[PDB]
Amino acid sequence: KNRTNTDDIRSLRVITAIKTPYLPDGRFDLQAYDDLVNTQIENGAEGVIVGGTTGEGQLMSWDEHIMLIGHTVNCFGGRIKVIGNTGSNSTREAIHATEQGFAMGMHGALHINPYYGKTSIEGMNAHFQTVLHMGPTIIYNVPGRTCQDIPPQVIFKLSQNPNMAGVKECVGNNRVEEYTEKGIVVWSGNDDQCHDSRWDHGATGVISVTSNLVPGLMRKLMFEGRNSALNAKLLPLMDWLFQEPNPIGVNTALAQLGVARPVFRLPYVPLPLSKRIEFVKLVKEIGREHFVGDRDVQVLDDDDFILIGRY
Template sequence: MAILKSYGACLRESSFQFPRSHRIDNYKRRNVKWRSPQAAIIPDFHLPMRSFEVKNRTSAEDIKALRLITAIKTPYLPDGRFDLEAYDGLVNMQIENGAEGVIVGGTTGEGQLMSWDEHIMLIGHTVNCFGGSVKVIGNTGSNSTREAIHATEQGFAVGMHAALHINPYYGKTSLEGLVSHFNSVLPMGPTIIYNVPSRTGQDIPPRVVNTVAQSPSLAGIKECVGNDRIEQYTGNGIVVWSGNDDQCHDARWSHGATGVISVTSNLVPGLMHELMFNGKNASLNAKLLPLIQWLFEEPNPIGLNTALAQLGVVRPVFRLPYVPLPLEKRVIFVELVNEIGRENFVGEKDVQVLDDNDFILVGRY
């Protein structure tokens, strides 16, 4: 008790040691003129990565050269956890068939159904296993700038080559807010901005893109608005990847797009490689269009998940709210595979029509 009393006395004594000028300084600080939020932004303040090795990672120029990037599917075990064995098989098939990059945890990879721990783990796993053979682009975007900053820091810390960033969805923001959001993450490393108004509810207009394009970290735009918009950007020297598989052939060969960020290449990577690398090929494009249209009859990745399960390369497990396509659509897919040729699709098993009872729907995982 005596010790406690003496300690309390010390605290009381120490409380009188602050000089009078300190209180005056506090008063002055409370009366400093308010500055606008824009003026108060400190560039790069949040960046902890200053090592020599990090500075010499993949440059934006390296990302700009990629022609075929696959938005890779994330497969699951029956309990809803990642099936990393199946995932590694999918990525290997992409590399073997000429894909130059993969988007990890994008819309197709169901990043929206992942915790951030799962998200960053999968990015790190992909870098660790395949980073020497393919560029790993992690989807670390968010409608919260704070989350986007934190996830992007973590993504680059585990070695991803570039980040994919969407504009803030649902709540949305002003055009000035879009610029500030992207400028908060661009300094971290090579970045692809993803414009898909059908999902976000808001277009990223050229005014915003032309402003943030001043950053040397902007690798380019994944553009889903259409080929007229793509040509507008490519005419100004901005790199663009088509985000629409059904338009990517014309985007590449008639509108200046560097290539495509593709869903369809999960299924037929070799044919998509041919479409992006070997010049105009209207007949091949026409051959693939029925498959592409089938894939997107329901919101992506419902069609892709169903197709890969029927090809036998992933387990027929769906994380809700995604569910498989109905039986009649599953039958049509088998017909499409036979028309295009089973040898052009991933995997080695015969394609089959799965029954409703073959699918596992997981709500908690």
């Protein structure tokens, strides 16, 4: 019913938080975006978050956001689950974005707790209750960005709603175990923990940044059983990706791989030259064929980069 739709989200192991690429004037580069999503599908990504933090949703106008979701459903909705990031620190915005995203056929919603303008436990519950009934929902707990832990009592209460698909959890393995042991579906939101969460702590899978770069490896990591060697091989890449706040790393890497133009909407700027040289090295160690795109990786010069505040 609504049951089957929620179940469809719950069964996904590899969800890519897809990067939004830009044209030199700062508008969406839909061609490059379409290529990224095709690559994700071809390498076994089962879902995509559209316009999340990795996708710089907070930098979009609301129409762009609604357009990108609609676009993703229309082009790829039969080949991958499309999960719109329709959350907000404003309940009103979360309501409208969520209903519009479902009306347009997205398969689920990702909902963060109100950040910056944080609220009480009662308010957080009230917030989630306005959107939980609209369709399959992933609750996103990322206290390092929201500055407010979504406590277990909120998660467990929400999980009585059949539309609550599960949790993107970033607090760690202990918090993951706490939920999975009670049968709540958890996706790890931390690339560098998702192997252990998957195989040691009952996590269903990952909502991933790293899969933007190496979707095949991330798929292996989530499906083919424990593999501490593969996990260790990815760690330097993951450390490189998160040395500045996401999505600064993935934006830089995808430019370097030639699959997105070197165009940044502020307030994001690329990793400096020395870090770009590091990246070339990491690609060589892991093998360029494992990374998205066909073009030889480039370091890029500082002045290849376009930084835009007005677009």
